[PDB]
Design a binder for this molecule. Sequence first.
Ligand SMILES: [Zn+2]
Ligand SMILES: [Zn+2]
Lengths: 551, 208, 95, 258, 168, 142
Amino acid sequence: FGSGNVLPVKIQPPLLRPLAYRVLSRKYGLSIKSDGLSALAEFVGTNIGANWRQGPATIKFLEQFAAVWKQQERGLFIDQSGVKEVIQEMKERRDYFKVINASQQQRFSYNPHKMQFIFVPNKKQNGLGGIAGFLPDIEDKVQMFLTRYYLTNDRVMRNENFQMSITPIKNLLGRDAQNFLLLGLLNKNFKGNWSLEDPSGSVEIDISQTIPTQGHYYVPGCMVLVEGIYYSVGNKFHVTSMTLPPGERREITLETIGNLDLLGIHGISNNNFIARLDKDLKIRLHLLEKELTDHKFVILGANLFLDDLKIMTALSKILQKLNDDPPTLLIWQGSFTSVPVFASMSSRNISSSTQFKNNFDALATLLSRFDNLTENTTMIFIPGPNDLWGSMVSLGASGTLPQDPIPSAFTKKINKVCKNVVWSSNPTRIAYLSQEIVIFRDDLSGRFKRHRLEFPFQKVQETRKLVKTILDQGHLSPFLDSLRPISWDLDHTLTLCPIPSTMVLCDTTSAQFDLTYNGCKVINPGSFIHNRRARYMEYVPSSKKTIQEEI
Amino acid sequence: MYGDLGNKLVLEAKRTKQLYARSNQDVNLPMYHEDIIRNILKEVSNLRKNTEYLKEQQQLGMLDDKVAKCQYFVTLLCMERNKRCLLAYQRLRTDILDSMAWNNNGLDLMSSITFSQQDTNNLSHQEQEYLKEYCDLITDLKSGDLVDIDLSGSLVPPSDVFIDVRVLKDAGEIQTEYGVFNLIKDSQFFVRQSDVERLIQQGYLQKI
Amino acid sequence: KIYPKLHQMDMDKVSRVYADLRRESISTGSFPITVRHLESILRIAESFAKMRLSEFVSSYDLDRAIKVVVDSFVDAQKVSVRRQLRRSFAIYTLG
Amino acid sequence: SVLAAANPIYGRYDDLKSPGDNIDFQTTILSRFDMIFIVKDDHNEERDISIANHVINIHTGNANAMQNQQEENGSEISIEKMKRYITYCRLKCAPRLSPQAAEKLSSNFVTIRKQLLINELESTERSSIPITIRQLEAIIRITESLAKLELSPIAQERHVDEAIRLFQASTMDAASQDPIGGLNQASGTSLSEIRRFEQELKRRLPIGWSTSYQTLRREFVDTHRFSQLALDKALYALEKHETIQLRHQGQNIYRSGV
Amino acid sequence: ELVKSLCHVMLLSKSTILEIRTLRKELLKIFELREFAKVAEFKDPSLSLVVPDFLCEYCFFISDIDFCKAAPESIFSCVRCHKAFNQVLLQEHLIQKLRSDIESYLIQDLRCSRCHKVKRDYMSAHCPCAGAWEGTLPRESIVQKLNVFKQVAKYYGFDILLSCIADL
Amino acid sequence: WIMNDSEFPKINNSGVYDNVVLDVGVDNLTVNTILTSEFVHDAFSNDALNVLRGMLKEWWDEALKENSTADLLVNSLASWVQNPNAKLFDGLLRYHVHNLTKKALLQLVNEFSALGSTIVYADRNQILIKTNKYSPENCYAY
Ligand SMILES: [Zn+2]
Ligand SMILES: [Zn+2]
């Protein structure tokens, strides 16, 4: 705040504290600590020449120091940071974008009694966790599906059409007739019979004369709306109709939840208070469309193999063109190995972990050539089924959904050759200004096709069916714990109660598509190489996309 | 009949008033009643539908006017009663919020450090917004023509120049006009009353 | 006149004896043992302390009480298992 | 209010014999008790050591030197304070049920009254511990008593769940003694069919590997050997700690030992 | 510790129990300790971490290696033939053991605290019995297992397993 | 579950023994187990098992008649069984082999229990036996 005076005379704070006290402690603010007072002596002594008898200068300085403490939350006591806020003041006279992993995402529970979300303190911050702090507690296993049921039932009960209403199952124990609307998990009992389950209880289900609503998938492990008649001669709910819970747009969903900063980039929330913000959204929507079409981030075709030579040559040819106009973000996705890497008892050949390391060293050679792409592009690394830690147990199969990033030990100098590189979990959330994008990599179509209810009674239609099921169920894993185990405390990562604005859903078993639904956009990159053709697609935050091919 | 539910809401208000009346220290508002309020909203919507239906059924000319007037009046009166109950509940809750906002020396309340009297989730979102603008109004009052007088100061008359105080919570050295106070816990001070009013109000000192 | 106390004593020996007596009853025995028999050892220890006109119970009295209780249980068994039970319970009464 | 204590015939419960041969109280008197607790000893070593230490601390004087502290801090209150709290609560509050509480209670009554029918039909003899309308009114009273503690003017599902759990722990546990074997007319053919099925299962399935309840039902019942009472036969084989284990949400039946 | 470990060796006789137990009490009389004191009981000083079925390529031998009790010159060498092993293979096997243990904890079954039985519901609060749902594999066991791996990775130099511990 | 069960049972009877103790080493356990021998959902196919049995029998017979390659195949079969990198590898086969070896070891211990002796230890490569006699010089014939 100005310079060029004679020299910084040194004076003791005793002759400075009365003015600061009257301006701060009396009127607005308080707690000028002794160390903070000594800190506030240097900057006022920088322009000390001909002052303490002057006019506005000191008062305006104290006013400006108060401006930070009204703006930032800070606290009460003034400490050695007092110079740190004046650095911000002189600062005053893209950004705000992040990539959130599964582990670093904030946790929020839901109270059905209160219709509201309650914060959960993270165990990493306060718990010691020096030896075992990531491990969940058994109580989460008991509430894992109860949390899903509560979220879906709230949405079903707030729909416009419903006001027959959904009845708890145990309310059917004495009735011999009438109709009921039951909502619950569809599964198989320990006896092998199809059944429906809600927190109240369970009931067996008869499909012998069921007429389902075509247009979506009926896989065990998902919420289903059902209608029929209950017979007390046995215990059977004879079904006459079957559907899935309706979906809800995020604009109508946000108002119910207020303005909670779930993926909070505005700020953070703790056990004391939560954060909301509305006025900034308009101006940042303005900035999103303020002639920023130059931003360009690219998702490559999934499942690219580094060990193969033709794939590496095709990637070099693709980066040749990417060098010309550097993408804003470049997301390398899919399994980076063509074979699962396991303990490899045979040591006659070179170890598979060392081979994994070596295959990540050729990337440095191929990438160091293109200096501009290093200089002004950020790369996002998505894991796959055959990466290091998972394949040590699953041996190439698909297991736990929250998949940890690639270890930093076997990939070390790719952080040097490239400028911005971030490793991310299998499900991740890119927060770009007023936009949330979800990155997910698995084969969904095969598992849907294999597991269907099969009621006793052009290929792009399957894509619409998959999109509708995934979006209406509001969850990325419409499956029981048997088909796919889930980390108990990380399940909130996989629940889409607010529908994401943009979705990255790659499946090698499903053809590429571009669909729109209730307030979102779903794109499907897949099969990096196909029919001797290497494909990769571009997407722009202004909701336009392009497909670029290089044999 | 139609308004019989709203009476329950009013009853709840009465209970809150008692907690406001029998309050040696500041208290917290109970949970909001969005479910009951939504029930009155649903029934007044049904009353609006009934009034519409009466409008068409009269304007096709199947019913006598004297007959239709009675149900018209009944629906209007029920809606008026429901409005009265809701407004009374809202005004009582608003008055308590205003009292708390004044009794924290202005400030932004929940965003900044609060005296922990109230939990965040008790208040409704509109109430949370209202509290914010009311606090801003207090703030730009305190910077008006009455700068010298602290409009959020103590409201008990001054009658003791020198008082004995005891520290409740530990802290560091704090500068005051022409001196320093060292807040070592379990220590006693004999000092002028004006210097320690702020610290007593914020819970760092005891006695007077 | 006398009212002895139990300030310093070996809790572990008494706990082990009680647990062993409880175990060796349901397995092979028809003498009911409950928490009510744990307190009898302490009562007999206090009685032996009274015999000496002492105001504090020592280790000898507690050991003697344990021996009395163990001998009262072993000798009410069948002739088949008595020899095994006596050997199994003999470690506690070393003195 | 009545608080009663008694011993069974023969002194101990004698779990080997029938419940009707153990309780000498008629159905007329047993229907006027809201909660009935049957108390048994399990003879576990860990519990025996814990109880022994707790009792020795009482005798050696270490009891009081602890208790006062907790009574001081936040965890216990004196007899007079609790007496005054009881009288204040009884003279001030009298809670009422909510519409959802009645719905949750009716279904529980229907369930606990249905179960008795299956038990009586299986054991072909009447139950010694009866379930009646008084047992519904008892759960209502327990719910309101739980609400009374907090001076709440309304009883809700939170109290209903705890009242139901207390009733299950007290009276349904006593009713459901689940005799392993009584050698009575009930399951008379089972006296040999149990051994028959055990041999057929242990010859089919070696000490390793597993099967399913679906298959063990379909294939072993196609030969018309079903008895409708094989649900507890698997659990009885499990009780041997070697024949049967149940895993994977009860779907998987694993042979674990001889 | 010397006197306790010396008496424990004598105690394994099953035929001279009384004679050894008298001497133990007499020796414990030198110290101010009683014969049944908890501080005077013997416990095994060492834990165990057994990796099963390791192959010797030049020997065709199946051996189970325990990384805690076994002395050196045996961890890194085959028994039948004194041929050295390859260390990174050992580290990879240890990592496999750790990840498999974590998976096994994550896919366990629930039980009633009183009715030792399996939970057969996806959404329930407790047993039909008034009880609670507890785990078949308690957390303390897996915590101790993660504890021992850290010490094993630090006594011998295993960089890969040390990195694997810190990425959790 | 079947790919996470690689632990073998053991016997560790402890004490001080004043009789003679024998330290025998049992080799060829797995090949002996293989050569000797609907409802079940966790078992390997019996036909392929019999094919493998016949293969091992013929290999052993030719190995007896001074064949180096047959001896190498017989020695390397056990290594082949447990290796996933080897093709045609099935986890059910490994579980089947381990489960039959587990039964075979217990049967061998029971067979030793037929004569006066007591097992002390068992580790698939070392077995310790307690004899009735008191002097080592008198156990040559037994
Ligand atoms: Zn070797
Ligand atoms: Zn239970």
